[PDB]
């Protein structure tokens, strides 16, 4: 019932403090915040702040535009 | 163009390493050591990347003043 994934809390780069937009050329890192099909998880799932989520989605969508992801 | 061609040859040399972004590193102490050395030892810094204090000492004669002071105690005064 209380199975909480705190390993993700410890090991997540985004919640560390780094700027999500700084990773726009890292499809490997960004792929850990998208579904199998490529959709972006909601904030309730990702756990990121509002600012971090907006920057992360912004970076992801950009990566898609450039074609690296 | 000389720098351009030299750096291009070095980078696209096969023997040179190439970052694939497939692995990850295990985890700044050297940078902190440089900064703290420049923070405390000031104009006496021997590090490659000195700070503005060295130029300030030059324009103030502080370095030359101290150098002649110590040298005058050493060779003339035999101390």
């Amino acid at each position: 019932k209380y199975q909480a994934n705190k390993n993700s809390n410890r090991n997540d780069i985004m919640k560390s403090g780094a700027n999500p937009l700084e990773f726009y050329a890292r499809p490997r890192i960004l792929s850990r915040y998208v579904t199998s099909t490529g959709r972006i998880q909601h904030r309730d799932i990702t756990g990121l702040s509002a600012k971090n989520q907006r920057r992360l989605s912004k970076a992801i969508r950009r990566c898609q535009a450039i074609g690296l992801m | 163009e000389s720098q351009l061609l030299k750096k291009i040859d070095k980078v696209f040399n096969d023997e040179t390493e190439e970052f694939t972004d497939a692995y990850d590193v295990t985890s700044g102490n050297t940078t902190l050591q440089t900064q703290i050395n420049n923070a405390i030892m000031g104009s006496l810094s021997n590090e490659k990347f000195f700070d503005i204090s060295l130029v300030d000492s030059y324009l103030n004669k502080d370095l030359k003043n101290i150098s002649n002071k110590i040298d005058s105690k050493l060779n003339p005064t035999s101390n």
Binding site: - | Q3, N46, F50, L54, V55, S57, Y58, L59, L63, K64, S67
Partner: protein, 228 residues
């Protein structure tokens, strides 16, 4: 008709002060972020001297790698200069430098940034910039509104200056290129103005079918015939 017409937005054409500031912003070797060429060059020379004699004195036992090519050091210098060159930066920096110059040329004493004349000079620089922008983005209605507001604010401060210190008021408005009417009449940047002063050099508004204007024009231009 025989009086003088001054644009409330741009003022008299070819104002010496405005053209001089624009020329200053477009000189051979100008840098951004407040780096003057003489200071940067002599600072780099000081850096080289610093390293030279520091290595020589601390390393009386010769441990120095060697002397570096003067051409290589000049390459470093040109690198810095290309980084900091003004014409390689934004126009934000240009407006900032122009505002600095205007402040120093209108301040009553070193450090006066709140005097009405200095305020007016800074808003004049900003108005020039936004007018240049609108002239290429004529549909930018938000920025047109901002420009209108800024021009009206300049009018407000200049009216206060007229009410407080008339001498400085006249001095400043004449130096800028604005006349007392352009400072003391209603203004809206309407299509009427924007066509009369040819903001884009094109027609913007149409007249009603009533031809009374041409009627009076010709009835007063009948001088060639037997009228007066």
């Amino acid at each position: 008709a025989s009086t003088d017409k001054v644009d409330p937005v741009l003022g008299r054409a070819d104002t010496p002060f405005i053209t001089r500031i624009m020329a200053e912003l477009k000189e051979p070797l100008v840098l951004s972020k407040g780096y003057n060429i003489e200071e940067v060059d002599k600072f780099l020379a000081a850096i080289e001297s610093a390293k030279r004699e520091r290595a020589e004195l601390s390393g009386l036992n010769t441990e120095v790698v060697g002397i570096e090519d003067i051409e290589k050091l000049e390459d470093r210098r040109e690198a810095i200069l290309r980084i900091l060159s003004m014409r390689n930066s934004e126009n934000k920096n240009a407006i900032k430098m122009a505002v600095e110059l205007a402040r120093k040329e209108f301040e009553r004493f070193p450090g006066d940034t709140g005097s009405s004349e200095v305020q007016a000079a800074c808003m004049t620089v900003r108005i020039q910039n936004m007018a240049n922008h609108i002239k290429e983005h004529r549909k930018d209605f938000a920025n047109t509104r901002n420009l209108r507001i800024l021009v009206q604010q300049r009018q407000a401060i200049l009216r206060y200056l007229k009410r407080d210190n008339p001498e400085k008021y006249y001095w400043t408005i004449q130096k800028l290129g604005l006349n007392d009417a352009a400072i003391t009449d209603e203004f809206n940047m309407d299509r009427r103005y924007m066509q009369d002063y040819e903001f884009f050099g094109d027609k913007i508004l149409i007249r009603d079918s009533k031809k009374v204007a041409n009627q009076k024009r010709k009835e007063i231009r009948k001088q060639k015939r037997a009228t007066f």
